[PDB]
Design a protein around this ligand. Structure first.
Ligand code: HEM
Ligand code: HEM
Ligand code: HEM
Ligand code: HEM
Lengths: 146, 141, 141, 146
């Protein structure tokens, strides 16, 4: 994915201030709450029928931490997304059969979470930069799938 | 369909946004044109620059249509009939674009109202905007 | 919204399909489970094998709901209320899946009725199925 | 993309019988007719307001021929989709800004066109094989985009 110097720089800057132990569980939980069909993918997690039961579920938090981890590794290899994500693509595509539209969905929930945490600092240009990185990750995750 | 709690949340968000509505609508539009260039092609003769007065003005029109939808949750298609013919049967707006604007509208709220944009509110607002999008692309189905 | 020509096309397709409806519905279901494995997870205790009697049976139920939608173009949500609560607020069927089934339903018609599945008919059928999908995922918006 | 021997073989077989000068214009035209917003991308083509004006438009036919050409080249390098499609991805993503959902759309219209031409020979298993190849092409076309 091609980021201008100011985009590439804005992404890194904001990301350095992200609470890696929180933001991922928040994006996951929000996804599960806003698009309830995605809960089917995590029955093992337990009762996801109220937002609070979702946001505070230990497993949601723990697992979101792993997702956020995956994005970070993408922000470090923006030039080789199909790379670090070759593994996660097989788990999500060949094994789980997650429709790509759902990757888009989670990538946009992440963007709302970042907007939530940074307020006016999450300017339209900065959002624009993250939308590029997010679409990349989604597309990379959807390779060797179908 | 919007549950009773969803209506409450949606109207509560609307009341808190208050006078900022037009401005947040213009901000959402700016986020959409910048994050998703494809949408720009829909407004060729528009001044799409940052402080554009024309984007400010369009933002207010969008916010007002949203206010109108908020006031007609159960009567939406009658409420936005013209608007639906405009986007669906005339401009032929790609349905995807509505999801993209819906998203920028939520991003705008979350940037201004972090404390109040809780998961539950986020879900109610998303349902609401999807109901509006359903209508606006209605003439297609 | 379905234009007068769209209703004509849709009903004409329905009349031609005739007694084959249940069977085409079962064929569409088979195309969906095979082309898009994710959908299978929605029917765990189903015998999903080729000649499955249970898929044959489910195909007929789908075709009949479609016939019911065809008969209530302007009254669809009232017409498929239960059905909507079932898929939207209980099974939580991913909206994408509806687009996938809609597609297999069109593929099935095109395989059986090439001469009659013209671009214009294809467009009318697609509008129709998207109206049904809008309703079935309705409870979400 | 990974096809079983019978899928891989079914694809090749059917494809050998495809009228390359017709099928592509048909998929394009059907796309323009069924999802009318896509016409915006081809204003230069002229009046696309009736299906007949679309299906018979020389430019639609000529251009669909080029698309079909692109799919064929994909069927020949199923192992390197991101390859032959690196070029078309930049034209469609970096220049045209076509949402990926629209690639999915055209890939499924192609499948209906094939079903139309082959009748009962376009069995569920054969459709299943083509859906895999089609999703691959779409995802490859959506790389280096966003
Ligand atoms: C923005 C894209 C996404 C990223 C970065 C991501 C990342 C991850 C990571 C890093 C893991 C653990 C992988 C491993 O241990 O090898 C995981 C597992 C998984 N993901 Fe995702 N994911 C994404 C989207 C989704 C979505 C959209 C769903 C479906 C609604 C989903 C469903 C799952 C499931 C079911 C597992 C395994 C759950 C378990 O560990 O019990 N993922 N994901
Ligand atoms: C939340 C959804 C939306 C609402 C509430 C909304 C509302 C409006 C309103 C109130 C108007 C002015 C109507 C008039 O003067 O007759 C308008 C016009 C317009 N909108 Fe939307 N709209 C939405 C989404 C979209 C999207 C997604 C696009 C394109 C990416 C779009 C494209 C346009 C265009 C091209 C015009 C005409 C601008 C002009 O030339 O004057 N709209 N919209
Ligand atoms: C054209 C759209 C569809 C129509 C017209 C339709 C119609 C029906 C009908 C008539 C029933 C039986 C209702 C009852 O007995 O109460 C049913 C149940 C069901 N459908 Fe759908 N449906 C559609 C799409 C979908 C999709 C896309 C999925 C999933 C990929 C889905 C999942 C199910 C499930 C899991 C059941 C319950 C099966 C059982 O356990 O008995 N439906 N559908
Ligand atoms: C299944 C995916 C698709 C394939 C295989 C495909 C293939 C092609 C090919 C081979 C060309 C000429 C490229 C060149 O000369 O370098 C082309 C051009 C183009 N395509 Fe696509 N395409 C796809 C989807 C789409 C869709 C979905 C749209 C948008 C609705 C679109 C819009 C265009 C435009 C505007 C051009 C240039 C038109 C011109 O030559 O004047 N394409 N495409």
């Amino acid at each position: 994915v091609h980021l201008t110097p100011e985009e590439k720089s804005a992404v890194t800057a904001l990301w350095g201030k992200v609470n890696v132990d929180e933001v991922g569980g928040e994006a996951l939980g929000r996804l599960l709450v806003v698009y309830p069909w995605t809960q089917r993918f995590f029955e093992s997690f337990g009762d996801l029928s109220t937002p609070d039961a979702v946001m505070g579920n230990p497993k949601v938090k723990a697992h979101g931490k792993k997702v956020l981890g995956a994005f970070s590794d993408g922000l470090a290899h923006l030039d080789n997304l199909k790379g670090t994500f070759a593994t996660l693509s097989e788990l999500h595509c060949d094994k789980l059969h997650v429709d790509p539209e759902n990757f888009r969905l989670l990538g946009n929930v992440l963007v709302c979470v970042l907007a939530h945490h940074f307020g006016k600092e999450f300017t339209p240009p900065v959002q624009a930069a993250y939308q590029k990185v997010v679409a990349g990750v989604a597309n990379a995750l959807a390779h060797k799938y179908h | 369909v919007l549950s009773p709690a969803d209506k409450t949340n949606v109207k509560a968000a609307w009341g808190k946004v208050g006078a900022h509505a037009g401005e947040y609508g213009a901000e959402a539009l700016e986020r959409m044109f910048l994050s998703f260039p494809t949408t720009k092609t829909y407004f060729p003769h528009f001044d799409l620059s940052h402080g554009s007065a024309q984007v400010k003005g369009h933002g207010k029109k969008v916010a007002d249509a949203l206010t109108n939808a908020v006031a007609h949750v159960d009567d939406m298609p009658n409420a936005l009939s013209a608007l639906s013919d405009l986007h669906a049967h005339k401009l032929r707006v790609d349905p995807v674009n509505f999801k993209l604007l819906s998203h920028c509208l939520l991003v705008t709220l979350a940037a201004h109202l972090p404390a109040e944009f809780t998961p539950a509110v986020h879900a109610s607002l998303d349902k609401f905007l999807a109901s509006v999008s359903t209508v606006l692309t209605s003439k297609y189905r």
